[PDB]
Ligand binder design. Structure first.
Ligand SMILES: CC(=O)O[C@H]1C(=O)[C@@]2(C)[C@H]([C@H](OC(=O)c3ccccc3)[C@]3(O)C[C@H](OC(=O)[C@H](O)[C@@H](NC(=O)c4ccccc4)c4ccccc4)C(C)=C1C3(C)C)[C@]1(OC(C)=O)CO[C@@H]1C[C@@H]2O
Ligand SMILES: Nc1nc2c(ncn2[C@@H]2O[C@H](COP(=O)(O)OP(=O)(O)OP(=O)(O)O)[C@@H](O)[C@H]2O)c(=O)[nH]1
Ligand SMILES: Nc1nc2c(ncn2[C@@H]2O[C@H](COP(=O)(O)OP(=O)(O)O)[C@@H](O)[C@H]2O)c(=O)[nH]1
Ligand SMILES: [Mg+2]
Lengths: 296, 412, 426
């Protein structure tokens, strides 16, 4: 199979960034594969699959991997998209996008409906808080359990089932879900394309950026789920590096990893997208964001 | 002049209890005396409660005894970010209040261990803040060094690395003593196979009394805390000197207290008596402070040092011509009546910094990296709000010190 | 540092009855009396398990949960059954049938509601709550079944606090219940996903210890539970008293589990001698380690010699020097390095308390996490599948309320745990 492919996204040069402090050339762009770090001095080399921004917008970023991803999912393949970023990194612009410039989500929806007898689109949206998941497919007012199928992979039980006939319906789904959202929590948006005369799942993951700052053990708990996920990627990275490895995957460690296990244990391509700021002061932020993806 | 001590951690309180006992005892002050210029902080109520019900119970005040009746643990992360940043506000207030009462304090005397949770995390943020508010003060710490083999915790080196990574920039001089070496001295010289924790602490207290208490007293050649770091630390990084004593003879088996200055001093240049596991394998002496307390003749000291200088066996640093700080006091080394120390009329306190510390760091760092390689109990730190980045940055900083020390000496 | 004890199931209640009969002597508390302790040190730590109220009547925080009224009734009519408050008596006169699904999905589910209320009431006492203690058997309706739902809600309510569970492992040679493996597989599933600390106590190993190391002709159930209770006190209670190196549940767990896969611990006891001829007073220091790290001293059926010592927590209780303790432990790790894990510098976390179990001079409690414990799971796994493939008494679970796939859910998890262990063993 393919390796977890990590793409780095550099927020387009914002006024607020340069106004905050001397952005200058903290993050340098030396080819699309690697990035040079000159953080005002700190030296580091960032190796990724493909780097986008600050020149490259969202559309160009989507057209690259996501455009193909949608087509693959429509075929019946399983695909998972990972979106990470801390405060002001510009995650909202990259994932959701703006009003004029649609992000990956709205643009993906356009391609989903473009493929359009057995064609049922099931979209679910749930967020995780304190190791407990809550179905955002609707509700403002309020146990969810992962059971494992004969296939081996676990499924989320008690999830809502809504059909998405129009693109605007899918958009409205997220809007409502986002309203009842718990810097806190991980929400997953799953778009299933069920085509019949076939199961495919396209899931988006909004990951919280981690915190060492001052409910019990909220930051530490979510920080753990962040590290467990990373360890899982690392295990696979070295697994594909060598001919074979024991590969003890920490899926059981966190509730999120078990949902992810369905895709991660099965056949499917993974897309790791980390969006950071090119600012110098945000070096500590970007550093932790880069450490999540890992070095080669 | 005055120096407020900050004893932190179970071992810190235990050592402080023995240290303060000798302090008041050698001053002829009863348990029901004067006002102690020190504070005790920990995360286990039982540790502090022991002092509130033990010896010198009414010698201390409840204001200088913080009780964290929540959790203690043995991990840096917990005792720093989770519950560590809980009582830090109150603790900082207490020391600042005392600093306002004192008359021109020189600095603070830190007392803790590199291992544990409270003695690692708390100290790290405590000194961090203290160096921000009182940066124009002398930062002298007595960090108890974990044994090379005899570790008390599985995550012992997992905490020490982090402690010596952050406090390294917020410290001036860290006097390190090896716990395992204490057993060595007690077995080789004292010839005792029953060294209780109190005995280990009493030996260190004997040193502290000669480093602060007696040194702060009027002598023939006074030495301030400022003079200490000015000669002990030739670099900005917080160097770790060794605490070596001279009269380590027993008060029962051996009886030859009538040792000349040339003998007692020569006893502080042997691995059998160094109070640390940093054997003189390749440790070049860059700075050596010799504090003599008791009946000491100026010329005898000068002759003793010269004798060692021309010995050639003890190699010094190339850029270090005369790295010997002389200190001569008058009051003899006071010893506990019911102890194991012979009690002499003169004592020598050898405080030297060499390249031998590199070997110690190399071992501790290696032990940490081996555990970090397999992740280990890292999950017990992550849940406390600590990220992998912190551990890695600590490892990198430690590696810098490993190279740094080997760059100080070794090469000419 | 307050801790609350909860007993689930018939076996759990029986073991607890013994625990609160031994710990009472540890603190010197009369059945319906006050502090009659010899010394005064015991009074300075009574708030750990006992709760203040009347003053003279020190009540122990031990909630009794069982679907069998007869079990709780016999305890409440015992020599130490009157010390329990009616509030802690969470009885449920329902189907006490030996079935996991029964004590979890049907009868257990409805009784849990009341348990949750009582546990909350006891958790909001004073000082600071450390964790919870649970005693249950992996082969009972309320034991394995209710014990599961109990810990599930407990960890969900207070995930900040620890969970010290005592799991009674079914005897490999001769089990008690026929549906024991079925219940055990289901209990271990939630155990590894809820509790953080769990000790393995074997039924047959208990007999062996009292037969070979001790001179007991007929090891009655009360006698068996006595030994276990006298061991657990040296873990929790003993780590609450002042000593050379004071430890605690956090200090233990955070220095015993290298991975968040629960990791079961195997208990043991060094001073395991008879009152007669074995009174040799051979308890200087080497004898303690000699018996502590003994294959026939393990409270579990599995021997650590066949596996590797991942982490060992040695808690000593008595006046002894740090030199004789730590130095002896080093010798053990160096001599038995073949199975002491080479990826860890020190695997033995030492702890020395200054308080023996009353009528004793020197004592040391053994708690070791070894990969050899996988043989235990392998045994249950083999027993399970053997009857699972034929669906022996599966109908008993489906009759109450259980998923056909639920059976595999627990099996796959238990099997995956064995894998994790073995990977690190080699
Ligand atoms: C005259 C004398 O010294 O008698 C000893 C004695 O003969 C021996 C054999 C005791 C005895 O223990 C047993 O025979 C035993 C019976 C059932 C299950 C397990 C053990 C003793 O009964 C047990 C008793 O233990 C205690 O007092 C501890 O405090 C212990 N207490 C209990 O278990 C307990 C028993 C009844 C009621 C309440 C508490 C303890 C241990 C750990 C943590 C907390 C408490 C002791 C020293 C003795 C007797 C009385 C004969 C031994 O056991 C213990 C736990 O100490 C068995 O091997 C040891 C060695 C002892 O020397
Ligand atoms: N010399 C000496 N060493 C001690 C003493 N007490 C403990 N130590 C050593 O210091 C380390 C123990 O630290 P702990 O007691 O576990 O922990 P702590 O540093 O007090 O803080 P916590 O982990 O949060 O309890 C071990 O390496 C012991 O060998 C003592 O009284 N004297
Ligand atoms: N050590 C020990 N085991 C017990 C006791 N009572 C039952 N057991 C064990 O527990 C298992 C039976 O479960 P049981 O306790 O009857 O379940 P429940 O009562 O329905 O929850 C068997 O393996 C027994 O050996 C006891 O008092 N002590
Ligand atoms: Mg402590």
């Amino acid at each position: 199979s393919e390796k977890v492919k990590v793409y780095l996204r550099i927020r387009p040069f914002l006024t607020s960034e340069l106004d905050r402090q001397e952005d200058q050339g903290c993050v340098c762009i030396e080819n699309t594969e690697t990035l040079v770090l000159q953080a005002p001095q700190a030296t580091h080399k960032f190796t990724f699959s493909q780097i986008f921004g600050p020149e490259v917008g969202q559309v160009a970023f989507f057209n690259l991997t996501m455009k193909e991803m949608v087509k693959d999912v429509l075929k019946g393949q399983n695909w998972l998209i990972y979106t990470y970023g801390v405060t002001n990194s510009g995650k909202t612009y990259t994932i959701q996008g703006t009003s004029k410039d649609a992000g990956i989500l709205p643009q993906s929806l356009a391609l989903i409906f473009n493929s359009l007898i057995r064609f049922s689109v099931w979209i679910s949206f749930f967020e995780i808080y304190n190791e407990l998941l809550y179905d955002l497919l609707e509700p403002p007012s309020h146990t969810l359990r992962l059971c494992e199928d004969q296939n081996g992979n676990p499924y989320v039980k008690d999830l809502n089932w809504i059909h998405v006939r129009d693109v605007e319906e899918a958009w409205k789904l997220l809007k409502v879900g986002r309203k009842n959202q718990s810097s806190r929590s991980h929400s997953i948006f799953s778009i299933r394309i069920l085509h019949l005369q076939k199961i495919s799942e396209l899931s988006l993951c909004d990951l919280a950026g981690s915190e060492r700052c001052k409910r019990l053990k909220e930051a530490g708990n979510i920080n753990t789920s962040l590290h467990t996920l990373g360890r899982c990627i690392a295990a696979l990275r070295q697994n594909q590096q060598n001919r074979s490895k024991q590969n003890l995957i920490p899926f059981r460690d966190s509730k999120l990893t078990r949902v992810f296990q369905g895709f991660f244990t099965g056949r499917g391509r993974s897309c790791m997208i980390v969006n950071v700021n090119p600012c110098a002061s945000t070096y500590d932020e970007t550093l932790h964001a880069a450490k999540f993806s890992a070095l080669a | 002049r005055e120096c407020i001590s900050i004893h932190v951690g179970q071992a810190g309180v235990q050592i402080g209890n023995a240290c303060w006992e000798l302090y008041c005892l050698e001053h002829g002050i009863q348990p029901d005396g004067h006002v102690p210029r020190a504070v005790f902080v920990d995360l286990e109520p039982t540790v502090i409660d022991e002092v509130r019900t033990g010896t010198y119970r009414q010698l201390f005040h409840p204001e200088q005894l913080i009780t964290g009746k929540e959790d203690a643990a043995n991990n840096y992360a917990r005792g720093h970010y989770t519950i560590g940043k809980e009582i830090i506000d109150l603790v900082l207030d207490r020391i600042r209040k005392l600093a306002d009462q004192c008359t021109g304090l020189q600095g603070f005397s830190v007392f803790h261990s590199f291992g544990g949770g409270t003695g690692s995390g708390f100290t790290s943020l405590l000194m961090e803040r203290l160096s921000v508010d009182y940066g124009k003060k002398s930062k002298l710490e007595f960090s108890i060094y974990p044994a090379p083999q005899v570790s008390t915790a599985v995550v012992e080196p997992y905490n020490s690395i982090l402690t010596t990574h952050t406090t390294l920039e917020h410290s001036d001089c860290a006097f390190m003593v090896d716990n395992e070496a204490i057993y060595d001295i007690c077995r080789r010289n004292l010839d005792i196979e029953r060294p209780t924790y109190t005995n280990l602490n009493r030996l260190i207290g004997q040193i502290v009394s000669s480093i602060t208490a007696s040194l702060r007293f009027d002598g023939a050649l006074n030495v301030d805390l400022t003079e200490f770091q000015t000669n002990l630390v030739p670099y900005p990084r917080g160097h770790f000197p060794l605490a070596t004593y001279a009269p380590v003879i027993s008060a029962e088996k051996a009886y030859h207290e009538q040792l000349s200055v040339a003998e007692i001093t020569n006893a502080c240049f042997e691995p059998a008596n160094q109070m640390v596991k940093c054997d003189p394998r390749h440790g070049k002496y860059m700075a050596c402070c010799l504090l003599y307390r008791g009946d000491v003749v100026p010329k005898d000291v000068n002759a003793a040092i010269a004798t060692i200088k021309t010995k050639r066996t003890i190699q010094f640093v190339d850029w270090c011509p005369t790295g010997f700080k002389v200190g001569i006091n008058y009051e003899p080394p006071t010893v506990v009546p019911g102890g194991d120390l012979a009690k002499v009329q003169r004592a020598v306190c050898m405080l030297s910094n060499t390249t031998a510390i590199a070997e110690a760091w190399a071992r501790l760092d290696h032990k940490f990296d081996l555990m970090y390689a397999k992740r280990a109990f890292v999950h017990w730190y992550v849940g406390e709000g600590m990220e992998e980045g912190e551990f890695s940055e600590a490892r990198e900083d430690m590696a810098a010190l490993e190279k740094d020390y080997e760059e100080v000496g070794v090469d000419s | 540092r307050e801790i609350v004890h909860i007993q689930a199931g018939q076996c759990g209640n029986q073991i607890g009855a013994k625990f609160w009969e031994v710990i009472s002597d540890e603190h010197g508390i009369d059945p319906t009396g006050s502090y009659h302790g010899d010394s005064d040190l015991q009074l300075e730590r009574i708030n750990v398990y006992y709760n203040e109220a009347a003053g003279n009547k020190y009540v122990p925080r031990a909630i009794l949960v069982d679907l069998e009224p007869g079990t709780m009734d016999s305890v409440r009519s015992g020599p130490f059954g009157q010390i329990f408050r009616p509030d802690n008596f969470v009885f449920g006169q329902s189907g006490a049938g030996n079935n996991w699904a029964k004590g979890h999905y049907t009868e257990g589910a409805e009784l849990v509601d009341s348990v949750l209320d009582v546990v909350r009431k006891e958790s909001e006492s004073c000082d600071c709550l450390q964790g919870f203690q649970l005693t249950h058997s992996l082969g009972g309706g309320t034991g394995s079944g209710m014990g599961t739902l109990l810990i599930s809600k407990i960890r969900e309510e207070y995930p900040d606090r620890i969970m010290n569970t005592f799991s009674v492992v079914p005897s490999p040679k001769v089990s008690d219940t026929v549906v024991e493996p079925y219940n055990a597989t289901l209990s271990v599933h939630q155990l590894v996903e809820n509790t953080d600390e769990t000790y393995c106590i074997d039924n047959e190993a208990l007999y062996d210890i009292c037969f070979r190391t001790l001179k007991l002709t007929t090891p009655t159930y009360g006698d068996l539970n006595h030994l276990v209770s006298a061991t657990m006190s040296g873990v929790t209670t003993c780590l609450r008293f002042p000593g050379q190196l004071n430890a605690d549940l956090r200090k233990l767990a955070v220095n015993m589990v290298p991975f968040p896969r629960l990791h079961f611990f195997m208990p043991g006891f060094a001073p395991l001698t008879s009152r007669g001829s074995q009174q040799y007073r051979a308890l200087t220091v080497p004898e303690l380690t000699q018996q502590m790290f003994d294959a026939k001293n393990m409270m579990a059926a599995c021997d650590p010699r066949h596996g590797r010592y991942l982490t060992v927590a040695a808690v000593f209780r008595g006046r002894m020097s740090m030199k004789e303790v730590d130095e002896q432990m080093l010798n053990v790790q160096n001599k038995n390095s073949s199975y002491f894990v080479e990826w860890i510098p020190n695997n033995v976390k030492t702890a020395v308390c200054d308080i023996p179990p009353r009528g004793l001079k020197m004592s040391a409690t053994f708690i070791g996490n070894s990969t050899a414990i996988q043989e235990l799971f392998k045994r249950i796994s083999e027993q399970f599948t053997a009857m699972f493939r034929r669906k022996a008494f599966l109908h008993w679970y489906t009759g109450e309320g259980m998923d056909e796939m639920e059976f595999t859910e627990a099996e796959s998890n238990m099997n995956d745990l064995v894998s994790e262990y073995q990977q690190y063993q080699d």
